[PDB]
Structure formats: C-alpha cells, structure tokens
Amino acid sequence: SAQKRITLYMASASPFPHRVRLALEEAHATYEMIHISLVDKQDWYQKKVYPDRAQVPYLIYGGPELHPDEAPSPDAAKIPESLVILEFLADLFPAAHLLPSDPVLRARARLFTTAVETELLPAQKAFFLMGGPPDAMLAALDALQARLPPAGGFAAGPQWSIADAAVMPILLRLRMSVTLEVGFFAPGAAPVVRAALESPRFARLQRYIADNVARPSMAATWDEAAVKAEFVGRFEKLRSLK
Amino acid sequence: SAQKRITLYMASASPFPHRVRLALEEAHATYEMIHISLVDKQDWYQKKVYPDRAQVPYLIYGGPELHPDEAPSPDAAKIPESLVILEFLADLFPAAHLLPSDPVLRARARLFTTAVETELLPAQKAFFLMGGPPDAMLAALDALQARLPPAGGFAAGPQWSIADAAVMPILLRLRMSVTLEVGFFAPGAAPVVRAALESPRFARLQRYIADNVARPSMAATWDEAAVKAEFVGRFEKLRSLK
Ligand SMILES: N[C@@H](CCC(=O)N[C@@H](CS)C(=O)NCC(=O)O)C(=O)O
C-alpha cells in the first residue's frame, strides 16, 4: 500500500520536465531526481536508461534506488512523454484529484491540454525559434486566455489540475525569453510581446499565472537562476551551431 | 435519460468520427448520430451547432432530443476532439473497461495513442496529401507494427482499448486509399505501399487489422460503401479546386 519508488530524469531549461515536477508536488509524492545533460545522453543515459530516444522527462516507477550511470531494474516501469506521465500520476494518486472527478470537467482539462500542445507550442516555436511576427504570438495568447474560464479559477474550473501543470512551465519560460530578450526574435518582436503580456489585454491570463505561482508547488519546482542559466546556455549553443 | 443522452455529429470519410463510434459500440452505449457532409458541408452546422471550428466528431451530452438544423441546448455539454471523446467515454462507462485498470497499462495505451497522433497521422498526410515518397510511409507503418505485442492481441495488451479505436480507422482508410489509388500520391507511390501492406513484412499488422475487424463493433461502425462514396467524393472535389 505504500507508494512505490519514483525517480524522474529531468533538466531545467525545457518546460516538459517541469510539468511532471508540478504534478509530483501536487500529489505530495516521494521522488528523487536525476539531471540529464548532453554529455549524460552521449555517455550513459542513451545506453543504459533510454535507448530509443534518450529524452527527458522519463519517469521510473518501482525498483530499487537509482543513481546516475546505472540501468533501471528490468522490473520497473519506464514512462516517457510529459503529458502521459501527467495522466499516469493522476491515476497513481487518485486521492490527490490531479484531475477532477466529473467526466465533463475531465474532458475540459484534456481539451485545454490538447490546445496547449497543438496550438500554443507551435506558435511559441514560430516566434522564438523562427523569428515570426509578434502579432501571431499574441493571437495565440489571446486564444489561450479565452480558453481559461472567464468566471475565474484554474484551467478546468475552480480546482487545480494537470491541465495547469501542462501550460504553466511554458508561460513562465515565454515570459523569461521575452524579458531577457533571449531568442531568435524578429527585430523588436520581443518587447512587443513583453509589453502586451503586462497590459490590460492579458488581465485574465495574468491573474491565472499569479494564482498558479502562489501555490507551494511552484516554489518547490521553479528555480529561476537554474532555469535562466540553462535556458540561456541552450540558446547560446543553438546560436553557435549555426 | 435527459441527463445522459448522447448525440454524435459525425461523417463517414474521416477517421476521426469512426474512432468515437468504435468506443460507443464497445461500451454498448445508447446514442444518436447526425451526419454532416464532408463534400458539401451544411451551413447550419457552423451557424447553429459548432461555430468555432465546424468539425466532426462533436459529441453532445445531456439535454433533449436533437435533430439536424437545430442548435444544441445551452445546458448540454459539447465535446470536440476525437481523442478527448474517447477518454470521456472511458470515464463515462467504467464497466466496459475501455482502458485497463492498472496505471502502467493505461500509460501503455496512452503512449500508443500519442504515437498514432504525432507520428502515424503526420506520415499519412505527407504521403496522401503532399505526394511524399512511399518509403517514409512504410517507415511509419514499420514503427507502428513494432509497437504491437508480437505474439498477438491488441495495442495495449490482450484486451481491446481506446488505443485500438484511435488507430483502426486510419489503417482501414489508408488501405482503401492505396488500393483504389484515391489520393494525391506521387507516381508509383500507392502501389508500393499497397503491395507492402499485403506482404509478409506486415503480417503482424495484418493480423491486428483482422482481429479488430472480427469484433462486432467493426460491423456496427464501418460501412465501407458509404465511407468510400464520401471519401472519393471529397477527394474529387478537393482535386477540382486544385
Ligand atoms: N483533432 C480533431 C480533428 C477533427 C477533424 O479534422 N475533422 C475534419 C475531418 S475532414 C472536419 O470535420 N472538417 C470540416 C471541414 O473540412 O470542412 C479530431 O480528432 O477530432
């Protein structure tokens, strides 16, 4: 009946491991983390841990204590894909209500997550990686904001859910990128987005971000210095290979 | 009941409504269907039913009886997005076991579905809509086949699940398209894939298709003459608009 072992392979720059950390903290799970860098991928993580894709996040469920440069027990479950890991944690910790009980509100959470993955993330890539115009990024943020309940609350309604885990790491890193002006932005594009995100246009979205940041799971999982250092480091690597 | 009435806006040519129909039948659900043409779409669909996107499937849950050319009640729930609808039906009908009970096995089903949506469907689009080469389509089919349990059974294990509902409509339409050569295929590309699908390389996938077709839910959801008529009609219309 006691929880089986959880080990999470992660990193800081990407939004995807942060999603999982938020859900683990909201579940009050016991877990250990292992940071994966490119050297780890090349030297042992692809070989001993995750041969098919060597990506993070990657959750190991069951088995004995796990350290870097070690293969997981063949008897443990290995789960990739941040969104699937979120649904897994909601199934594993039912008393935490990481998804709501009502089936329509569960559908609402999943519709919100679908839109994050299929609409917001492509828009962020077009803006940050491909130097697209700020108006298209702000239109995607308008659409995201309109999917939040206008009467208040979290993405699926009054209660926090894995839908909030899915989007909050992206919003925090988007704000960081446009505030530090770190990215492959069209000229002047970052300030346009930064200023709009602080304006009355985005009052609802600002309230939503604040509501999520005020929860204990955010302080437990957001280390601004570490995220910045790896985010900027990744950008400088991208810039240099080019 | 008025609390639990299901009305499904659907069509025949697209795989997406079929996915939903498979799960409804596996759950032995009671439901009504409204047919939206994918050749000459009824203007009342966008105007009265689904103004934002006017896509099928669209599931209406609760409220009074609903007929064509009528707006759903404001008090009924409206659920788009086939993969979300499948998860919704698994939540509504727990006794049908549309997903397995164990969290790890539920993750297995969800990983299979994610690969359908993010790997197989993009490959089909590149091949059928954009005239891409047949080896890229075969690579995606090889990868799908390798995700199946080798000894037999369904996508997530011995029992049927919504992972099977996600993929089987695509496989049936792919086979039909390459067999009739109805699509925007490169010269020579359709026969390469048609022959491969019938060859020993794809024996495991053939057995999979046959095991799904043998279930009663297939005859209750797959009218190949109606699918083909709308599929060909839509293709010929699209081609004529260049
Ligand atoms: N992600 C959606 C995709 C739905 C979709 O693409 N529907 C198309 C099938 S052609 C549609 O309804 N199109 C309306 C139109 O083309 O006018 C799902 O899985 O339900």
Author numbering:
A (entry chain B), B (entry chain A): 2 to 243
The study reports:
To further explore this issue, we have conducted biochemical and crystallographic studies on the interactions of six GSTOs from T. versicolor with chemical libraries. The six TvGSTOs (named TvGSTO1S to TvGSTO6S) used in this study are representatives of the twelve TvGSTOs that have a catalytic serine, while four others have a cysteine instead. In this study, we demonstrated at the biochemical and structural level that T. versicolor GSTs that belong to the Omega class interact with polyphenolic compounds found in wood, and in particular with flavonoids such as dihydrowogonin and naringenin. The ability of TvGSTOs to bind polyphenols through different sites suggests that fungal GSTs could be involved in the transport of various polyphenols.
The crystal structure of TvGSTO6S was solved at 1.45 Å resolution. As expected, it reveals the same overall fold than TvGSTO3S (rmsd 0.78 Å, 183 aligned Cα per monomer). While G-sites are made of similar polar residues, differences are observed at the H-site and at the interface between monomers. The lack of a structure with a ligand that binds in TvGSTO6S H-site precluded its fine description. However, when compared with the equivalent region of TvGSTO3S, significant differences are readily apparent in TvGSTO6S. Most of the residues that line the benzophenone binding site of TvGSTO3S are different. In addition, the extension of the C-terminal α-helix by two extra turns leads to an open and shallow H-site, contrary to the buried H-site in TvGSTO3S covered and closed by the loop corresponding to the extra turns. There are also slight differences between the dimer-interfaces of both isoforms. The larger residues of TvGSTO6S (L112 and T115 instead of T110 and A113 in TvGSTO3S) and the loss of the inter-monomer interaction between Y118 (replaced by E120 in TvGSTO6S) and E80 present in TvGSTO3S probably account for a more open dimer in TvGSTO6S. Its interface residues form a pocket centered on the two-fold axis of the dimer (rectangular section of 8 × 6 Å2), larger than the equivalent region found in TvGSTO3S (rectangular section of 7 × 4 Å2).
